[PDB]
């Protein structure tokens, strides 16, 4: 993909 | 607790001389950076906290602050290139690679994630992660006899990060890094989890997006049969990258294209060329256009699999972008096909939908269509049947459309149209 932010 | 801290409180805690106070504050920062809307990434950067977080990555004695700081930095690195750059500039890359060996899986996983964000920013940071030596320890995490023994989320993060190390061009990833990753990639491509499969296909789609020598590295690993199998999956997140990879492979040599045909790919295309998702239809027609650009025996396989009627279908009705790919597919087919193959094309009904597309306000598709008409006449001359074709074009309104294109401003359009009128419509 590209980028991912962790939210939980 | 640590819910909803102000940035200045976080700063106060991280600047204390108390590791537990620092842990508290780092967790508070992680919770700000994980919130649903508008994480204060820039406020955290401006507060000067990245170097503190990076130094916390090295505190083997306090694994919780390694985890919290790893999570905080991952989410800073998930943003803009400038935000990712701030993390890299703080020394994060070697610190995260060292954490891949952590005995705590949740920390190692977070380091995998962080490196995926960094590499996912673009070519330069991708190659910098590689130069710091990330591939060896990443692949070592997957050196198990059965991938099923790994935690599902853990394996998905590893696959996703590996796919980012395969991503981007100008330049493409180092050849030696690709060779190093590919055997593990071929193995992930056979894993049963839908998300692992999707990201493995994305990785292959990146690696086949290039010159024929790059395609060859992939095809030589024998993955084309597995890609065709995934082409028939019910999960759209799998079909999309699998189709992109197949499409990339058939932009290569005719020998590379033949591997796709031999693997049974053409039997999937009746459903792909009618797929409800317009992007699947478009990329399936694009793929077809680069198969009809091949040998006559490859054109013949398209015929045998009953796919010419489906090309007539998309040309007749589809999203315009798909219709343009279908026009290309027809021009390539008429350019390289035998006379019998071109005759069959006309008997399938290609002329009328081809003519109808001449009223499109796209000068490139008009050029493509006019080339195709010229090619079809050339096959008709060889049979002495120009007039029959001339009449067929007249009956469906094609002559009106070609006549007007003599008035088109584009030079190629009005030359080709006038040429057609003169030679066949007199």
Numbering used by the authors:
A (entry chain B): 48 to 55
B (entry chain A): 72 to 497
Verbatim from the authors:
Tat is a transcriptional trans-activator and plays an important role during HIV-1 replication by binding to a short-stem loop structure, known as the transactivation response element (TAR) located at the 5′ end of HIV RNAs. The classical nuclear import pathway is the best characterised mechanism and is mediated by an adaptor molecule, importin-α, also known as the classical nuclear import receptor, binding cargo that can display a nuclear localisation signal (NLS).
The final model consisted of 426 residues of importin-α, 8 residues of the Tat:NLS/CPP, and 319 water molecules. The overall structure of importin-α exhibited an all α-helical structure arranged as ten sequential armadillo (ARM) motifs. The Tat:NLS/CPP binds to the major binding site of importin-α within ARM domains 2–4. Here, we show that the C-terminal 55RRR is not providing additional binding to importin-α, and of the residues visible in the crystal structure 48GRKKRRQR, only residues 48GRKKRR mediate binding with importin-α. The overall binding buries 717 Å2 of surface area, and is mediated by 15 hydrogen bonds and 1 salt bridge interaction. The binding affinity was determined to be 1.2 ± 0.2 µM from three replicates.
